[PDB]
Protein backbone atom coordinates (compact mmCIF):
# COMPACT_ATOMS: atom_id res chain seq x y z
CA UNK A 1 0.00 0.00 0.00
CA UNK A 2 1.93 3.00 -1.34
CA UNK A 3 0.69 6.57 -1.02
CA UNK A 4 3.16 8.95 -2.75
CA UNK A 5 3.74 10.73 0.56
CA UNK A 6 7.48 10.06 0.45
CA UNK A 7 9.73 9.19 -2.49
CA UNK A 8 11.48 5.95 -1.59
CA UNK A 9 13.69 5.90 -4.71
CA UNK A 10 15.17 9.16 -6.01
CA UNK A 11 16.71 10.14 -9.34
CA UNK A 12 19.57 12.62 -9.80
CA UNK A 13 20.74 13.97 -13.16
CA UNK A 14 22.69 16.87 -14.62
CA UNK A 15 21.06 20.12 -13.41
CA UNK A 16 19.31 22.08 -16.14
CA UNK A 17 16.86 24.96 -16.40
CA UNK A 18 14.66 26.77 -18.89
CA UNK A 19 16.52 29.27 -21.10
CA UNK A 20 16.47 32.98 -20.28
CA UNK A 21 18.18 35.85 -22.04
CA UNK A 22 21.57 36.45 -20.45
CA UNK A 23 20.82 39.99 -19.37
CA UNK A 24 23.02 42.10 -17.13
CA UNK A 25 23.19 39.31 -14.54
CA UNK A 26 23.73 35.55 -14.93
CA UNK A 27 22.18 32.71 -12.99
CA UNK A 28 23.98 32.26 -9.67
CA UNK A 29 24.17 29.46 -7.16
CA UNK A 30 26.14 26.40 -8.45
CA UNK A 31 23.20 24.00 -8.13
CA UNK A 32 23.43 21.07 -5.72
CA UNK A 33 21.18 18.31 -4.37
CA UNK A 34 19.55 17.50 -1.03
CA UNK A 35 18.11 14.23 0.21
CA UNK A 36 15.18 15.15 2.47
CA UNK A 37 13.93 17.75 -0.01
CA UNK A 38 14.12 15.07 -2.70
CA UNK A 39 12.19 12.78 -0.36
CA UNK A 40 9.39 15.33 -0.04
CA UNK A 41 9.80 16.93 -3.48
CA UNK A 42 12.58 17.77 -5.91
CA UNK A 43 16.19 17.37 -4.81
CA UNK A 44 17.95 20.11 -6.82
CA UNK A 45 18.72 23.42 -5.10
CA UNK A 46 19.11 26.63 -7.07
CA UNK A 47 20.37 28.33 -9.02
CA UNK A 48 18.78 31.60 -7.90
CA UNK A 49 18.34 34.45 -10.37
CA UNK A 50 19.69 37.81 -9.17
CA UNK A 51 18.75 40.60 -11.56
CA UNK A 52 18.81 44.35 -11.15
CA UNK A 53 15.43 44.27 -9.42
CA UNK A 54 16.71 41.37 -7.33
CA UNK A 55 19.76 43.33 -6.21
CA UNK A 56 17.62 46.40 -5.49
CA UNK A 57 15.12 44.39 -3.44
CA UNK A 58 17.84 42.54 -1.53
CA UNK A 59 19.69 45.76 -0.68
CA UNK A 60 16.54 47.53 0.52
CA UNK A 61 15.42 44.50 2.51
CA UNK A 62 18.83 43.96 4.08
CA UNK A 63 18.98 47.62 5.06
CA UNK A 64 15.56 47.32 6.70
CA UNK A 65 16.49 44.09 8.51
CA UNK A 66 19.78 45.53 9.76
CA UNK A 67 18.01 48.67 11.00
CA UNK A 68 15.39 46.57 12.81
CA UNK A 69 17.94 44.23 14.36
CA UNK A 70 20.26 47.05 15.39
CA UNK A 71 17.36 48.79 17.12
CA UNK A 72 16.29 45.56 18.85
CA UNK A 73 19.82 44.92 20.10
CA UNK A 74 20.23 48.55 21.20
CA UNK A 75 16.97 48.44 23.16
CA UNK A 76 18.55 45.90 25.54
CA UNK A 77 21.80 47.89 25.78
CA UNK A 78 23.66 45.58 23.37
CA UNK A 79 23.54 42.61 25.75
CA UNK A 80 23.59 39.32 23.79
CA UNK A 81 22.33 37.44 26.85
CA UNK A 82 19.50 39.86 27.48
CA UNK A 83 18.81 40.00 23.74
CA UNK A 84 18.32 36.24 23.94
CA UNK A 85 16.07 36.65 26.98
CA UNK A 86 13.82 39.34 25.48
CA UNK A 87 14.05 38.53 21.76
CA UNK A 88 10.35 37.70 21.42
CA UNK A 89 9.35 40.69 23.56
CA UNK A 90 11.61 43.07 21.61
CA UNK A 91 10.03 45.35 19.04
CA UNK A 92 10.65 48.42 16.90
CA UNK A 93 7.66 50.56 17.88
CA UNK A 94 6.04 53.01 15.42
CA UNK A 95 6.12 56.76 16.07
CA UNK A 96 3.57 58.35 18.36
CA UNK A 97 0.40 60.17 17.33
CA UNK A 98 1.81 63.69 17.64
CA UNK A 99 4.26 63.24 14.75
CA UNK A 100 1.57 62.57 12.14
CA UNK A 101 2.83 61.14 8.88
CA UNK A 102 6.05 63.17 9.01
CA UNK A 103 9.47 62.05 10.12
CA UNK A 104 9.72 61.28 13.82
CA UNK A 105 12.97 61.47 15.76
CA UNK A 106 15.06 58.35 15.26
CA UNK A 107 14.52 57.23 18.86
CA UNK A 108 10.82 58.20 18.73
CA UNK A 109 9.84 56.24 15.61
CA UNK A 110 12.16 57.62 12.93
CA UNK A 111 13.96 54.29 12.77
CA UNK A 112 10.61 52.50 12.53
CA UNK A 113 9.61 54.73 9.62
CA UNK A 114 12.92 54.27 7.80
CA UNK A 115 12.80 50.50 8.29
CA UNK A 116 9.18 50.36 7.16
CA UNK A 117 9.94 52.40 4.05
CA UNK A 118 12.89 50.17 3.15
CA UNK A 119 10.85 47.02 3.78
CA UNK A 120 7.98 48.32 1.65
CA UNK A 121 10.40 49.19 -1.15
CA UNK A 122 12.03 45.75 -1.00
CA UNK A 123 8.64 44.01 -1.01
CA UNK A 124 7.47 46.03 -4.02
CA UNK A 125 10.76 45.37 -5.80
CA UNK A 126 10.31 41.67 -5.05
CA UNK A 127 6.87 41.92 -6.63
CA UNK A 128 8.47 43.47 -9.71
CA UNK A 129 11.00 40.63 -9.63
CA UNK A 130 8.26 37.99 -9.64
CA UNK A 131 6.54 39.77 -12.53
CA UNK A 132 9.76 40.01 -14.56
CA UNK A 133 10.79 36.42 -13.83
CA UNK A 134 7.38 35.15 -14.95
CA UNK A 135 7.55 37.26 -18.12
CA UNK A 136 11.13 36.20 -18.90
CA UNK A 137 10.19 32.51 -18.86
CA UNK A 138 7.37 33.23 -21.33
CA UNK A 139 4.81 32.49 -18.60
CA UNK A 140 1.86 34.31 -17.04
CA UNK A 141 1.96 36.74 -14.12
CA UNK A 142 -0.61 35.07 -11.84
CA UNK A 143 1.95 34.76 -9.03
CA UNK A 144 2.67 38.49 -9.21
CA UNK A 145 -0.99 39.44 -8.72
CA UNK A 146 -1.54 36.84 -6.01
CA UNK A 147 1.45 38.45 -4.28
CA UNK A 148 -0.02 41.90 -4.93
CA UNK A 149 -3.04 40.90 -2.85
CA UNK A 150 -0.76 40.08 0.10
CA UNK A 151 1.14 43.33 -0.46
CA UNK A 152 -2.20 45.14 -0.37
CA UNK A 153 -2.91 43.66 3.05
CA UNK A 154 0.63 44.50 4.23
CA UNK A 155 0.45 48.11 3.02
CA UNK A 156 -3.05 48.52 4.45
CA UNK A 157 -1.71 47.39 7.82
CA UNK A 158 1.43 49.48 7.72
CA UNK A 159 0.98 52.48 5.44
CA UNK A 160 -2.49 52.97 3.94
CA UNK A 161 -4.47 52.99 7.18
CA UNK A 162 -1.89 55.37 8.74
CA UNK A 163 -2.50 57.60 5.70
CA UNK A 164 -6.26 57.53 6.24
CA UNK A 165 -5.89 58.16 9.98
CA UNK A 166 -3.05 60.60 9.26
CA UNK A 167 -1.06 58.78 11.90
CA UNK A 168 1.54 56.04 12.23
CA UNK A 169 0.77 55.64 15.95
CA UNK A 170 -1.54 52.68 15.37
CA UNK A 171 0.70 50.84 12.91
CA UNK A 172 2.17 47.42 13.71
CA UNK A 173 5.63 47.17 15.32
CA UNK A 174 8.62 45.15 14.15
CA UNK A 175 8.65 42.45 16.80
CA UNK A 176 7.57 38.89 17.41
CA UNK A 177 5.36 39.34 20.46
CA UNK A 178 4.85 43.11 19.88
CA UNK A 179 3.06 42.52 16.57
CA UNK A 180 0.76 39.93 18.18
CA UNK A 181 0.08 42.48 20.93
CA UNK A 182 -0.69 45.00 18.20
CA UNK A 183 -3.18 42.53 16.75
CA UNK A 184 -4.83 42.02 20.14
CA UNK A 185 -4.97 45.73 20.99
CA UNK A 186 -6.23 46.63 17.52
CA UNK A 187 -9.10 44.19 17.98
CA UNK A 188 -9.85 45.47 21.50
CA UNK A 189 -9.72 49.16 20.57
CA UNK A 190 -12.31 48.64 17.81
CA UNK A 191 -14.79 46.30 19.45
CA UNK A 192 -14.47 42.54 18.94
CA UNK A 193 -12.88 42.26 15.50
CA UNK A 194 -14.97 39.10 15.03
CA UNK A 195 -17.81 41.54 14.40
CA UNK A 196 -15.90 42.99 11.46
CA UNK A 197 -17.67 41.35 8.49
CA UNK A 198 -14.62 41.58 6.23
CA UNK A 199 -12.68 39.86 8.99
CA UNK A 200 -15.33 37.14 8.80
CA UNK A 201 -14.89 37.00 5.02
CA UNK A 202 -11.10 36.81 5.36
CA UNK A 203 -11.39 33.99 7.91
CA UNK A 204 -13.83 32.23 5.59
CA UNK A 205 -11.32 32.45 2.74
CA UNK A 206 -8.39 31.35 4.94
CA UNK A 207 -10.38 28.34 6.14
CA UNK A 208 -11.43 27.74 2.55
CA UNK A 209 -7.85 27.95 1.33
CA UNK A 210 -6.75 25.33 3.86
CA UNK A 211 -9.80 23.20 2.99
CA UNK A 212 -9.16 23.58 -0.74
CA UNK A 213 -5.45 22.84 -0.56
CA UNK A 214 -6.19 19.73 1.48
CA UNK A 215 -8.95 18.63 -0.92
CA UNK A 216 -6.80 19.30 -3.99
CA UNK A 217 -3.64 17.84 -2.49
CA UNK A 218 -5.46 14.67 -1.45
CA UNK A 219 -7.16 14.44 -4.85
CA UNK A 220 -3.90 14.73 -6.78
CA UNK A 221 -2.21 12.27 -4.41
CA UNK A 222 -5.17 9.91 -4.88
CA UNK A 223 -4.83 10.01 -8.68
CA UNK A 224 -1.02 10.13 -8.70
CA UNK A 225 -0.99 6.46 -9.73
CA UNK A 226 -2.78 7.61 -12.91
CA UNK A 227 -0.46 10.44 -13.91
CA UNK A 228 -2.57 12.92 -11.96
CA UNK A 229 0.38 14.79 -10.47
CA UNK A 230 1.29 15.97 -13.99
CA UNK A 231 -1.43 18.59 -13.86
CA UNK A 232 -0.50 20.83 -16.79
CA UNK A 233 -0.29 17.82 -19.11
CA UNK A 234 -3.73 16.70 -17.92
CA UNK A 235 -4.90 20.26 -18.61
CA UNK A 236 -3.66 20.23 -22.20
CA UNK A 237 -4.58 16.55 -22.78
CA UNK A 238 -7.22 15.24 -20.37
CA UNK A 239 -6.23 11.83 -19.04
CA UNK A 240 -8.24 9.42 -16.93
CA UNK A 241 -6.65 10.81 -13.77
CA UNK A 242 -8.37 14.16 -14.34
CA UNK A 243 -11.61 12.39 -15.26
CA UNK A 244 -11.62 10.36 -12.04
CA UNK A 245 -10.63 13.42 -10.00
CA UNK A 246 -13.62 15.27 -11.45
CA UNK A 247 -16.01 12.33 -11.05
CA UNK A 248 -15.07 11.72 -7.41
CA UNK A 249 -16.07 15.26 -6.48
CA UNK A 250 -19.07 15.23 -8.82
CA UNK A 251 -20.43 12.09 -7.14
CA UNK A 252 -19.63 13.19 -3.58
CA UNK A 253 -20.49 16.88 -4.01
CA UNK A 254 -22.76 17.33 -7.04
CA UNK A 255 -20.29 19.48 -8.98
CA UNK A 256 -16.64 19.48 -9.92
CA UNK A 257 -13.80 21.55 -11.33
CA UNK A 258 -11.28 21.07 -14.11
CA UNK A 259 -7.60 20.34 -13.55
CA UNK A 260 -7.12 23.93 -14.75
CA UNK A 261 -10.02 25.61 -12.93
CA UNK A 262 -9.36 24.02 -9.53
CA UNK A 263 -6.22 26.14 -9.43
CA UNK A 264 -8.32 29.17 -10.34
CA UNK A 265 -10.36 28.42 -7.21
CA UNK A 266 -7.08 27.98 -5.33
CA UNK A 267 -5.79 31.32 -6.61
CA UNK A 268 -8.96 33.23 -5.79
CA UNK A 269 -9.50 31.87 -2.26
CA UNK A 270 -5.95 32.82 -1.30
CA UNK A 271 -6.19 36.24 -2.96
CA UNK A 272 -9.54 37.04 -1.35
CA UNK A 273 -8.29 35.98 2.09
CA UNK A 274 -6.02 39.04 2.05
CA UNK A 275 -8.13 41.34 -0.15
CA UNK A 276 -11.09 41.24 2.25
CA UNK A 277 -8.64 41.54 5.13
CA UNK A 278 -7.11 44.71 3.72
CA UNK A 279 -10.58 46.14 3.13
CA UNK A 280 -11.64 45.34 6.69
CA UNK A 281 -8.49 46.95 8.07
CA UNK A 282 -9.03 50.06 5.93
CA UNK A 283 -12.63 50.29 7.17
CA UNK A 284 -11.92 50.16 10.91
CA UNK A 285 -11.27 53.41 12.74
CA UNK A 286 -12.00 55.42 9.60
CA UNK A 287 -15.62 54.43 8.91
CA UNK A 288 -16.48 52.05 11.76
CA UNK A 289 -15.29 53.10 15.20
CA UNK A 290 -16.69 50.03 16.99
CA UNK A 291 -17.37 46.80 15.12
CA UNK A 292 -19.56 45.44 17.91
CA UNK A 293 -21.91 48.42 17.63
CA UNK A 294 -21.95 48.00 13.85
CA UNK A 295 -22.91 44.36 14.36
CA UNK A 296 -25.64 45.33 16.83
CA UNK A 297 -27.00 47.92 14.40
CA UNK A 298 -26.96 45.43 11.51
CA UNK A 299 -28.34 42.38 13.32
CA UNK A 300 -25.19 40.40 14.12
CA UNK A 301 -25.63 40.82 17.89
CA UNK A 302 -28.68 40.43 20.15
CA UNK A 303 -28.67 44.18 20.92
CA UNK A 304 -27.84 44.24 24.68
Amino acid sequence: EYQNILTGVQVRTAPHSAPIAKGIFPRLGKPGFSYWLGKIGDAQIGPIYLGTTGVLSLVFGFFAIEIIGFNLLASVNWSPMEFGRQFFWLGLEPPAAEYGLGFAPLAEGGWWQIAGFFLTTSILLWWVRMYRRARALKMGTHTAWAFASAIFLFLSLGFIRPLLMGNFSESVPFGIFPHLEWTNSFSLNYGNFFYNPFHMLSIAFLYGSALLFAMHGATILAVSRLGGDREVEQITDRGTAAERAALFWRWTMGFNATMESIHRWAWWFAVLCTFTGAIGILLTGTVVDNWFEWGVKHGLAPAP
Binding site: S17, G41, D42, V232
Partner: protein
Protein backbone atom coordinates in the same frame (compact mmCIF):
# COMPACT_ATOMS: atom_id res chain seq x y z
CA UNK B 1 -27.07 14.66 -16.54
CA UNK B 2 -23.73 12.93 -17.15
CA UNK B 3 -20.37 14.33 -18.12
CA UNK B 4 -18.93 13.45 -21.52
CA UNK B 5 -16.79 10.79 -19.80
CA UNK B 6 -19.08 9.81 -16.91
CA UNK B 7 -20.99 6.91 -18.49
CA UNK B 8 -17.82 4.83 -18.44
CA UNK B 9 -16.93 4.58 -14.72
CA UNK B 10 -20.51 4.17 -13.41
CA UNK B 11 -19.90 0.54 -12.54
CA UNK B 12 -21.22 -1.14 -9.43
CA UNK B 13 -19.17 -2.42 -6.53
CA UNK B 14 -16.81 -0.50 -4.32
CA UNK B 15 -19.35 -0.20 -1.50
CA UNK B 16 -18.40 -1.18 2.04
CA UNK B 17 -21.96 -1.77 3.26
CA UNK B 18 -25.29 -2.27 1.50
CA UNK B 19 -24.38 -4.53 -1.40
CA UNK B 20 -26.37 -3.46 -4.46
CA UNK B 21 -29.25 -1.91 -2.50
CA UNK B 22 -28.03 1.71 -2.48
CA UNK B 23 -25.33 1.42 -5.17
CA UNK B 24 -26.88 3.99 -7.49
CA UNK B 25 -26.81 7.69 -8.35
CA UNK B 26 -29.37 10.45 -7.87
CA UNK B 27 -28.62 13.22 -10.33
CA UNK B 28 -24.89 13.82 -10.03
CA UNK B 29 -24.64 12.41 -6.51
CA UNK B 30 -23.68 8.88 -5.55
CA UNK B 31 -25.84 7.69 -2.68
CA UNK B 32 -24.72 4.36 -1.25
CA UNK B 33 -25.64 3.24 2.27
CA UNK B 34 -23.58 6.03 3.81
CA UNK B 35 -25.27 8.66 1.65
CA UNK B 36 -28.56 7.45 3.11
CA UNK B 37 -27.10 7.66 6.61
CA UNK B 38 -25.67 11.14 6.02
CA UNK B 39 -29.12 12.24 4.84
CA UNK B 40 -30.57 10.66 7.98
CA UNK B 41 -28.20 12.56 10.26
CA UNK B 42 -28.21 15.83 8.27
CA UNK B 43 -32.01 16.08 8.09
CA UNK B 44 -32.36 15.36 11.80
CA UNK B 45 -29.58 17.72 12.87
CA UNK B 46 -30.79 20.56 10.65
CA UNK B 47 -34.38 20.04 11.82
CA UNK B 48 -33.19 20.18 15.43
CA UNK B 49 -31.20 23.35 14.69
CA UNK B 50 -34.29 24.96 13.15
CA UNK B 51 -36.32 23.78 16.16
CA UNK B 52 -33.83 25.44 18.50
CA UNK B 53 -34.13 28.56 16.36
CA UNK B 54 -37.90 28.41 16.85
CA UNK B 55 -37.40 28.09 20.61
CA UNK B 56 -34.97 31.01 20.35
CA UNK B 57 -35.96 34.68 20.28
CA UNK B 58 -34.53 35.85 16.93
CA UNK B 59 -34.90 33.89 13.68
CA UNK B 60 -32.05 36.21 12.75
CA UNK B 61 -29.75 33.75 11.00
CA UNK B 62 -26.66 35.23 12.67
CA UNK B 63 -28.34 35.36 16.10
CA UNK B 64 -29.67 31.80 15.94
CA UNK B 65 -27.74 29.76 18.50
CA UNK B 66 -27.95 26.28 20.02
CA UNK B 67 -26.33 26.42 23.36
CA UNK B 68 -24.68 23.47 25.11
CA UNK B 69 -25.90 22.66 28.63
CA UNK B 70 -24.61 24.76 31.49
CA UNK B 71 -21.45 23.40 33.11
CA UNK B 72 -23.53 22.67 36.21
CA UNK B 73 -24.74 19.54 34.40
CA UNK B 74 -21.22 18.14 34.01
CA UNK B 75 -21.02 15.35 31.45
CA UNK B 76 -24.64 14.36 32.06
CA UNK B 77 -27.24 14.25 29.32
CA UNK B 78 -29.31 17.40 29.61
CA UNK B 79 -33.04 18.04 29.16
CA UNK B 80 -33.85 18.83 25.55
CA UNK B 81 -35.19 22.29 26.43
CA UNK B 82 -31.96 23.31 28.19
CA UNK B 83 -28.80 21.76 26.76
CA UNK B 84 -29.94 18.39 25.40
CA UNK B 85 -30.73 19.68 21.91
CA UNK B 86 -27.12 20.79 21.48
CA UNK B 87 -25.98 17.31 22.50
CA UNK B 88 -28.25 15.56 20.01
CA UNK B 89 -27.16 17.96 17.26
CA UNK B 90 -23.55 17.17 18.18
CA UNK B 91 -24.13 13.43 17.88
CA UNK B 92 -26.03 13.86 14.61
CA UNK B 93 -23.22 16.04 13.23
CA UNK B 94 -20.62 13.43 14.17
CA UNK B 95 -22.68 10.70 12.53
CA UNK B 96 -23.20 12.78 9.39
CA UNK B 97 -19.49 13.59 9.11
CA UNK B 98 -18.55 9.93 9.53
CA UNK B 99 -21.15 8.91 6.95
CA UNK B 100 -19.76 11.54 4.57
CA UNK B 101 -16.21 10.26 4.94
CA UNK B 102 -17.31 6.64 4.52
CA UNK B 103 -19.30 7.50 1.40
CA UNK B 104 -16.15 9.15 0.09
CA UNK B 105 -14.34 5.88 0.81
CA UNK B 106 -16.92 3.98 -1.25
CA UNK B 107 -16.56 6.47 -4.11
CA UNK B 108 -12.77 6.12 -3.96
CA UNK B 109 -13.06 2.33 -4.18
CA UNK B 110 -15.53 2.60 -7.07
CA UNK B 111 -13.19 4.88 -9.02
CA UNK B 112 -10.10 2.89 -8.02
CA UNK B 113 -8.25 5.91 -6.62
CA UNK B 114 -6.43 6.40 -3.35
CA UNK B 115 -8.23 7.04 -0.07
CA UNK B 116 -6.32 10.27 0.59
CA UNK B 117 -9.43 12.48 0.50
CA UNK B 118 -11.47 10.71 3.23
CA UNK B 119 -8.30 10.43 5.31
CA UNK B 120 -7.78 14.19 5.01
CA UNK B 121 -11.43 14.80 5.90
CA UNK B 122 -10.89 12.62 8.96
CA UNK B 123 -8.69 15.38 10.36
CA UNK B 124 -11.48 17.96 10.10
CA UNK B 125 -13.85 15.49 11.75
CA UNK B 126 -11.25 14.97 14.49
CA UNK B 127 -10.90 18.72 15.00
CA UNK B 128 -14.66 19.06 15.41
CA UNK B 129 -14.78 16.08 17.79
CA UNK B 130 -11.91 17.52 19.84
CA UNK B 131 -13.83 20.79 20.07
CA UNK B 132 -17.20 19.28 21.07
CA UNK B 133 -16.38 15.90 22.63
CA UNK B 134 -12.77 15.30 23.63
CA UNK B 135 -12.07 18.69 25.22
CA UNK B 136 -15.46 18.92 27.03
CA UNK B 137 -14.96 15.38 28.37
CA UNK B 138 -11.46 16.18 29.64
CA UNK B 139 -12.71 19.44 31.15
CA UNK B 140 -15.62 17.59 32.74
CA UNK B 141 -18.67 19.37 31.32
CA UNK B 142 -20.53 19.61 28.03
CA UNK B 143 -20.75 23.38 28.54
CA UNK B 144 -17.16 23.76 27.36
CA UNK B 145 -18.19 22.93 23.80
CA UNK B 146 -19.05 25.68 21.48
CA UNK B 147 -22.63 26.82 20.83
CA UNK B 148 -24.07 26.04 17.41
CA UNK B 149 -24.63 29.58 16.20
CA UNK B 150 -23.27 31.87 13.52
CA UNK B 151 -21.97 34.69 15.69
CA UNK B 152 -22.31 32.98 19.08
CA UNK B 153 -19.64 30.39 18.35
CA UNK B 154 -17.38 33.38 17.70
CA UNK B 155 -18.36 34.69 21.14
CA UNK B 156 -17.31 31.29 22.45
CA UNK B 157 -13.98 31.52 20.60
CA UNK B 158 -13.29 34.99 22.00
CA UNK B 159 -14.37 34.11 25.55
CA UNK B 160 -12.24 30.97 25.69
CA UNK B 161 -9.28 32.76 24.10
CA UNK B 162 -9.37 35.54 26.67
CA UNK B 163 -9.94 32.98 29.44
CA UNK B 164 -6.16 32.45 29.27
CA UNK B 165 -5.81 36.26 28.99
CA UNK B 166 -4.04 36.12 25.63
CA UNK B 167 -4.47 33.01 23.56
CA UNK B 168 -1.79 34.01 21.03
CA UNK B 169 0.88 33.01 23.56
CA UNK B 170 -0.21 29.37 23.30
CA UNK B 171 2.87 28.07 21.42
CA UNK B 172 0.90 25.30 19.72
CA UNK B 173 -1.49 28.04 18.62
CA UNK B 174 1.46 29.98 17.20
CA UNK B 175 2.55 26.90 15.29
CA UNK B 176 -0.96 26.22 13.99
CA UNK B 177 -1.28 29.83 12.83
CA UNK B 178 2.10 29.53 11.10
CA UNK B 179 0.96 26.37 9.33
CA UNK B 180 -2.38 27.89 8.27
CA UNK B 181 -0.72 31.02 6.88
CA UNK B 182 1.92 28.91 5.12
CA UNK B 183 -0.83 26.72 3.66
CA UNK B 184 -2.55 29.80 2.26
CA UNK B 185 0.74 31.11 0.85
CA UNK B 186 1.60 27.73 -0.68
CA UNK B 187 -1.88 27.43 -2.19
CA UNK B 188 -1.53 30.89 -3.73
CA UNK B 189 1.87 29.98 -5.17
CA UNK B 190 0.66 26.63 -6.52
CA UNK B 191 -2.52 27.89 -8.15
CA UNK B 192 -0.59 30.83 -9.57
CA UNK B 193 2.18 28.63 -10.99
CA UNK B 194 -0.27 26.20 -12.59
CA UNK B 195 -2.35 29.00 -14.10
CA UNK B 196 0.73 30.83 -15.39
CA UNK B 197 2.08 27.63 -16.94
CA UNK B 198 -1.27 26.86 -18.58
CA UNK B 199 -1.99 30.50 -19.60
CA UNK B 200 1.33 32.09 -20.58
CA UNK B 201 0.01 34.96 -22.74
CA UNK B 202 -0.52 35.80 -26.39
CA UNK B 203 1.35 33.27 -28.43
CA UNK B 204 3.21 31.66 -25.54
CA UNK B 205 2.80 27.91 -26.00
CA UNK B 206 1.85 25.94 -22.89
CA UNK B 207 4.86 25.49 -20.62
CA UNK B 208 6.06 22.17 -19.26
CA UNK B 209 7.15 20.92 -15.84
CA UNK B 210 10.66 22.21 -16.52
CA UNK B 211 9.38 25.79 -16.89
CA UNK B 212 7.44 25.50 -13.63
CA UNK B 213 10.54 24.20 -11.84
CA UNK B 214 12.67 26.96 -13.39
CA UNK B 215 10.31 29.70 -12.22
CA UNK B 216 10.70 28.93 -8.52
CA UNK B 217 14.35 27.97 -8.94
CA UNK B 218 14.97 31.49 -10.26
CA UNK B 219 12.71 33.40 -7.87
CA UNK B 220 13.16 31.48 -4.59
CA UNK B 221 16.13 29.21 -5.19
CA UNK B 222 14.21 25.94 -4.82
CA UNK B 223 11.30 24.20 -6.52
CA UNK B 224 9.41 21.38 -4.81
CA UNK B 225 8.06 19.67 -7.92
CA UNK B 226 4.65 19.18 -9.51
CA UNK B 227 4.06 16.04 -7.42
CA UNK B 228 5.71 17.09 -4.16
CA UNK B 229 3.75 20.35 -3.97
CA UNK B 230 0.46 18.53 -3.41
CA UNK B 231 2.23 16.41 -0.79
CA UNK B 232 3.53 19.42 1.12
CA UNK B 233 0.19 21.21 0.81
CA UNK B 234 -1.84 18.33 2.20
CA UNK B 235 0.72 17.90 4.99
CA UNK B 236 0.62 21.64 5.70
CA UNK B 237 -3.16 21.73 6.05
CA UNK B 238 -3.34 18.52 8.11
CA UNK B 239 -0.52 19.71 10.39
CA UNK B 240 -2.23 23.07 10.89
CA UNK B 241 -5.34 21.22 12.01
CA UNK B 242 -3.30 18.85 14.20
CA UNK B 243 -1.55 21.71 15.98
CA UNK B 244 -4.83 23.58 16.43
CA UNK B 245 -6.24 20.43 18.06
CA UNK B 246 -3.13 20.24 20.24
CA UNK B 247 -3.42 23.88 21.28
CA UNK B 248 -7.05 23.37 22.26
CA UNK B 249 -6.34 20.18 24.22
CA UNK B 250 -3.50 22.01 25.98
CA UNK B 251 -5.88 24.80 26.99
CA UNK B 252 -8.22 23.66 29.76
CA UNK B 253 -7.53 19.91 30.00
CA UNK B 254 -3.80 20.47 30.60
CA UNK B 255 -3.06 24.18 31.12
CA UNK B 256 -5.47 26.29 33.18
CA UNK B 257 -3.63 29.59 33.42
CA UNK B 258 -2.33 32.66 31.62
CA UNK B 259 -0.57 31.72 28.39
CA UNK B 260 1.46 34.99 28.31
CA UNK B 261 3.24 34.17 31.57
CA UNK B 262 3.82 30.57 30.52
CA UNK B 263 6.79 32.03 28.60
CA UNK B 264 8.62 33.13 31.78
CA UNK B 265 10.27 29.71 31.63
CA UNK B 266 12.12 31.11 28.61
CA UNK B 267 13.02 34.26 30.54
CA UNK B 268 14.63 32.21 33.33
CA UNK B 269 16.91 29.71 31.59
CA UNK B 270 20.17 29.34 33.55
CA UNK B 271 22.39 31.01 30.94
CA UNK B 272 20.48 34.28 31.07
CA UNK B 273 18.53 34.07 34.34
CA UNK B 274 20.30 37.19 35.61
CA UNK B 275 19.36 36.47 39.21
Amino acid sequence: ALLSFERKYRVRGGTLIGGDLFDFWVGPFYVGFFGVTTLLFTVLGTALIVWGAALGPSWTFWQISINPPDVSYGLAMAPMAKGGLWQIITFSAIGAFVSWALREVEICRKLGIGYHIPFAFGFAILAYVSLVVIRPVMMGAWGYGFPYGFMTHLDWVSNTGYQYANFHYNPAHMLGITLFFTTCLALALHGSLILSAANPGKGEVVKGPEHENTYFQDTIGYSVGTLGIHRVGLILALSAVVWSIICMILSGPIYTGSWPDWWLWWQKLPFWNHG
